[PDB]
């Protein structure tokens, strides 16, 4: 592992999206500095996803763990729901569909 690069992120981002869709993630977009192409080896990965109906935290953990596994690096997932109204709106402005 290590050496995580945006160019490489797209590699997992593609598979992550496929699995994300399977786990229950429609709003698969990148929000934050990461989406802007900013994130050091000591930074976190902010991802804003929206879980449809039937999806439980179980899937979240599975996705979060799957993300960390595929990315082999810490991955922070956020749910539009738990999110905020003023934050969500702002998050969207950042959220980028890969």
Structure description:
Helix 1 packs antiparallel against helix 3. The protein has one domain (1-98): Beta Polymerase, domain 2. The longest helix has 18 residues, at 6-23. The two termini are 22 Å apart. It has a 4-stranded mixed β-sheet with strand order 3-2-1-4, with helices on both faces. By secondary structure, it is α+β, with helices and mostly antiparallel strands. The protein has 4 helices and 4 strands. Residues 14-95 form the Polymerase nucleotidyl transferase domain. GO terms for molecular function: ATP binding; metal ion binding; nucleotidyltransferase activity. InterPro entries: NT_sf, Polymerase_NTP_transf_dom, Type-VII_TA_antitoxin. It comes from Thermus thermophilus.
């Amino acid at each position: 592992g290590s050496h995580m690069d945006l160019e490489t992120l797209r590699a997992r981002r593609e598979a992550v999206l496929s699995l994300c869709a399977r786990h229950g993630a429609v709003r698969v977009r990148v929000f934050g500095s990461v989406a802007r192409g900013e994130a050091r080896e000591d930074s976190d990965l902010d991802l804003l996803v929206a879980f449809e109906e039937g999806r439980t935290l179980l899937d979240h953990a599975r996705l979060k763990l799957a993300l960390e596994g595929l990315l082999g690096v810490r991955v922070d997932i956020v749910s539009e729901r738990g999110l905020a109204p003023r934050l969500r709106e702002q998050v969207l402005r950042e959220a980028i569909p890969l």
